[PDB]
């Protein structure tokens with residue numbers, strides 16, 4: 001039996017909501033967000049990791065195209081191969097494609113492995129969120145209702161299970177008769193509920209939230 005609700009923000013495992021701007025780097029924000037939580041769990045320190053590092057460096061070898069899109073999974077593989085990722089403070093976000101400027105002197109996290117969860121399995125996603133930490137996911141955000149969301153549990157009748165926007169599932173719950181996923185977006189603090197959107201849970205993989213989940217890990221040693 002899993003907890004009825006979880007919110008990794010209450011464990012100090014989630015950094016401030018970021019603002020991707022006109023650069024399509026939600027995949028990089030989803031990836032660093034998941035890794036930030038594992039880093040806090042392991043070292044006790046909460047530090048924003050560099051999304052810009054992924055945009056500029058996890059490029060064609062990883063099937064990614066910076067501001068024109070990418071994958072959380074191959075962002076993790078880049079961090080594995082690179083043997084690190086810089087802090088966001090040392091390599092801050094510029095919302096544009098740049099030359100890779102990774103500097104091991106400012107390494108703030110490492111990545112040992114990542115795991116992918118089965119398509120559409122909201123039970124498995126719930127278990128991972130409860131027992132592993134925030135989970136990187138894609139959602140179908142191509143709906144004016146998504147851009148216009150202010151509060152409550154988001155439900156979009158025309159949503160599909162094809163994903164196009166990377167976000168971070170930092171929890172779940174059940175409020176006002178509606179089960180939801182607690183989702184950290186990267187459109188700044190003025191989007192939704194202080195930068196978060198609660199999305200309908202157990203409604204047949206609504207907006208593809210469980211289509212392509214993955215989470216990274218940092219192992220001892």
Ligand SMILES: CC1CCN(CCSc2cc(-c3nn(C[C@@H](O)CN4CCC(N5C[C@@H](O)CC5=O)CC4)c4c3CN(S(C)(=O)=O)CC4)ccc2C(F)(F)F)CC1
Nearest residue numbers: 027063064065068069070071137138162163164165166212
């Ligand atoms: C320029 C492109 C523009 C679009 N972006 C993503 C679109 S957004 C997006 C898409 C996905 C995503 N992952 N996968 C699984 C697989 O395809 C991933 N790949 C497996 C093999 C891997 N590897 C390992 C290497 O060794 C070789 C290789 O190929 C590489 C990864 C799919 C999708 C989209 N779906 S769909 C239309 O929903 O059905 C098709 C299948 C996930 C998150 C996002 C998120 F929104 F969160 F960002 C990608 C770059």
